[PDB]
Amino acid sequence: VAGLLNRFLGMYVPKQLKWEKVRLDNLELQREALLPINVIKGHLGHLVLHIPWKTLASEQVKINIEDVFLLASPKERTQTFAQALVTKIVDNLQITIRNIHIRYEDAISAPGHPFALGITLEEFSAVSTDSDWTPAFITSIQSAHKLATLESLAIYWDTDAKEHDEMLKFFREMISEHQFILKPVSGQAKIEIDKTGSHTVPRYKANLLFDEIGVVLDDQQYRDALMMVDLFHYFIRHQEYKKFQPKG
Amino acid sequence: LEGLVAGLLNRFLGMYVKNFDPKQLKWEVWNGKVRLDNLELQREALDQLKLPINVIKGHLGHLVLHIPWKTLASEQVKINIEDVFLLASPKEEQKRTQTFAQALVTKIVDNLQITIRNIHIRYEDAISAPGHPFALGITLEEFSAVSTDSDWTPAFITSIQSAHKLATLESLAIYWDTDAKLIGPGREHMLKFFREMIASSEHQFILKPVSGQAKIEIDKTGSHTVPRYKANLLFDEIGVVLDDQQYRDALMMVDLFHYFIRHQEYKKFQ
């Protein structure tokens, strides 16, 4: 239990953690946490895990994360029991995250016109539900029904734009006149994941109800839109690009 | 105005329609409405999109155009199209008159009201992913677009700075068939096949039918101060579904979207 958490945590991010409730603050992620983005800097403000250790496997767990930011840039026997434990505990957990700001700044691309790319979301909630989308603690084999809830989803992409205490404020102030492309939107998504692996049923089903999406484009963004398409293809498919890098 | 608009119509039509004849338009002298039935589209019809695609077959079942000649300056044109089917395949390797026609067309399309019904666009690809042919599809029960005011009320409007359009989609569905059975350029007026599409498990739908409304505001100023494009979308529950077969082909598909988008820049001269 505690050892698993500690080891995993150790690498992404110890004596004090005792796995009794838990509480953490001001965790700075590693530069090698993972996408080709090199994490220039990464920071998680506050984190909380509430484990019902005595009553585990009867009722769902809880983890609440407050203030996580991410900054990035382009770059040149016992184990089987443990695994089943991790499976059952992760299958019915509830995650609640607020104030998340992933901002990715590219300077090398579109040379001479550096841009900053950004995703803003100040509340996300994913929980396990039953076949009929009423939330519950169901343990099932055939399919997993997750329900996520998404408040203030916003994306900004602004062309021609550029210490720990200052940086945190900068990352958190945005959540209003930046060149947003996706106005803040709130909605709910019903994901259903198949575990049978059968070829008669889909791997993923999603029913997302969103309200009032507004998307805005400007002349700079419209000009760089094709360049941007190239960018996203690159994130998603970088290994295919790898052969073309020079080997003289 | 009747003769000029008629000739312009024959230019525009002539660009996209296979074997066009000016005799194809049927006019109603009683009101000045014009209708066309059973159009055939040319292979190069979708070129304006600059995609490496080839239109094996296209069909416009019924097309009707209502023009208010008498009140045309003060009232909008209307166009209804029914049964549009597109089967595309990937492609392997006087001064006053000109000015007046441009301004006239500008007024017409600025307040045009379009309603299209029973749309099926099908992309059959056997060349890429060889041995694993697939078919992509977009179906639309109805698509409509009208020009409106600042407050989204349909009205004839002429504004120098801004253009407001309200488009409604009813029953839009996208299907991605893996290892699909292709109609092909089999020349079997295909027509029946799209007939079945008007109307389930014969297609693998990544997008189950959804209806929605788009409020678009365009800025013709070109001013940096205001966004060139604005859009507000209100939709119904959106149901997306991923096959296990489609998920294995997903990365290849991302490749395809990019290759299509960027094809213009890799032109080969000869």
Order of helices and strands of chain A: HEEEHEEEEHEEEH
Instruction: Give the strand tally of chain A.
Output: 10
Q: How would you sum up the global shape of chain A?
A: globular
Structural class of chain A: alpha+beta
Instruction: Summarize the largest interface: chains and residue counts.
Output: A-B, 29 and 28 residues
Termini of chain A, distance in Å? 50 Å
Tell me the number of structural domains of chain A: 1
Main β sheet profile of chain A: 9 strands, mixed
Protein name (chain B): Intermembrane lipid transfer protein VPS13
Subcellular location (chain B): Membrane
Domain Chorein N-terminal (chain B): 1-93
Family (chain B): Belongs to the VPS13 family.
Sum up the structure in keywords.
homodimer, 248 residues, alpha+beta, nine-stranded mixed sheet, Intermembrane lipid transfer protein VPS13 (chain B), lipid binding protein, Lipid transfer protein, Membrane trafficking
